[PDB]
Design a protein around this ligand. Structure first.
Ligand SMILES: CN1[C@@H]2CC[C@H]1C[C@@H](OC(=O)[C@H](CO)c1ccccc1)C2
Ligand SMILES: [O]
Ligand SMILES: [Sr+2]
Ligand SMILES: [Sr+2]
Ligand SMILES: [V+3]
Length: 326
């Protein structure tokens, strides 16, 4: 493997990470109060859970995975059309909503063993969709339907979260969820998995993420122990973001997770990252604060947070360290 992709010794994954048997799998077709209670407990104790019987069509999930895999099978000459000035874009502000191919890593500088297609999905209009990939031919039709369905499911989950916290329904149905970035991640086979990472350990910086996977590689950090997240092809993995950790005043955990490489087979995952506009002010929900529950963060600019989150990887929560109080 090229030295560009060699992770620092301490960040390298061990070869036998055990299955996370305690990862909650929440059936959304249970009684309403049972769903609210199970989601609440998962958010409080884990910050990562799976949802099943979630009302998003299984056929649409399969068609979206198909067209995402078809995109990454396109030849070089087509993929160049999504590389600004001949190279992949970087996860840095301003983060534009038009489709680009992205490179990612840490600055002992190294790169993640990953190609990422990213674009905005909300609101859907002619201008946004016309900035999506031209190939495959059905990408725009399928991903337009997928993005609406994934948003619908995310807003259902956020309203379950509202009921669990004692916030009014629709608390997050505003500026706090106005950005919907869809990241299609391609992990080609890696000749030295012991030295590389598909994706470094991170919180998602946004509010909430729904992740679709059909192959192993996703791992979560629990009380410095890593566990493997079982791939369920018809489920969504829910990762609570650093923004939700702040707004709930740490009553909810954020999901710290990474992706390991595979020597023999490729892997495609689809992450829908919903969260605030860059103009937003983030603070602990006033409605939940008291003398017994004082705010642990001061108000901050999401744009200012974003710049630190995307550059400083000295700690998982480096993004919010400057805003910590009490
Ligand atoms: C694995 N990496 C992590 C998470 C996804 C991917 C790319 C990057 O995250 C983002 O670019 C998101 C886009 O919403 C972001 C940007 C600024 C603020 C909050 C969130 C870091
Ligand atoms: O992510
Ligand atoms: Sr190029
Ligand atoms: Sr175009
Ligand atoms: V993530």
């Amino acid at each position: 493997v090229s030295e560009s992709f060699v992770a620092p010794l301490e960040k390298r994954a061990e070869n036998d990470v055990p299955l996370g048997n305690d990862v909650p799998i929440i059936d959304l077709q249970q009684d309403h109060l049972v769903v609210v209670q199970q989601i609440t407990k998962a958010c409080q104790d884990f910050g990562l859970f799976q949802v099943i019987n979630h009302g998003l069509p299984e056929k649409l999930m399969a068609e979206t995975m198909d067209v995402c895999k078809e995109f990454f099978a396109l030849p070089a000459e087509e993929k160049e059309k999504l590389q600004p000035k001949g190279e992949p874009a970087k996860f840095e502000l301003p983060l534009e909503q038009k489709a680009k191919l992205y490179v990612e890593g840490e600055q002992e500088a190294f790169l993640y063993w990953k190609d990422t297609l990213a674009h905005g999905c909300h609101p859907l209009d002619e201008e946004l969709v016309n900035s999506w990939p031209e190939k495959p031919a059905t990408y725009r039709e399928v991903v337009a339907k997928y993005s609406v369905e994934v948003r619908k499911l995310t807003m259902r989950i956020l309203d379950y979260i509202c009921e669990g916290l004692g916030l009014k329904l629709g608390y997050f149905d505003n500026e706090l969820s106005q950005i919907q970035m869809m990241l299609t991640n391609y992990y080609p086979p890696c000749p030295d998995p012991s030295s590389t990472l598909g994706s470094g350990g991170h919180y998602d910086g946004n509010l909430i993420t729904l992740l679709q996977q059909n192959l192993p590689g996703l791992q979560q950090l629990i009380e410095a122990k890593w566990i493997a997240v079982e791939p369920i092809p018809t489920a969504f993995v829910v990762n609570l973001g650093l923004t939700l950790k702040v707004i709930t005043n740490e009553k909810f955990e954020g999901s710290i997770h990474r992706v390991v490489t595979n020597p023999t087979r490729d892997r495609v995952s689809i992450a829908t990252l919903i969260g605030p506009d860059y103009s937003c002010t983030i603070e602990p929900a006033k409605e939940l604060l008291s003398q017994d529950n004082p705010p642990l963060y001061k108000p901050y600019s999401y744009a200012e947070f974003g710049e630190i989150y995307l550059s400083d990887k000295s700690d998982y929560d480096a993004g919010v360290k400057p805003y910590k109080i009490n």
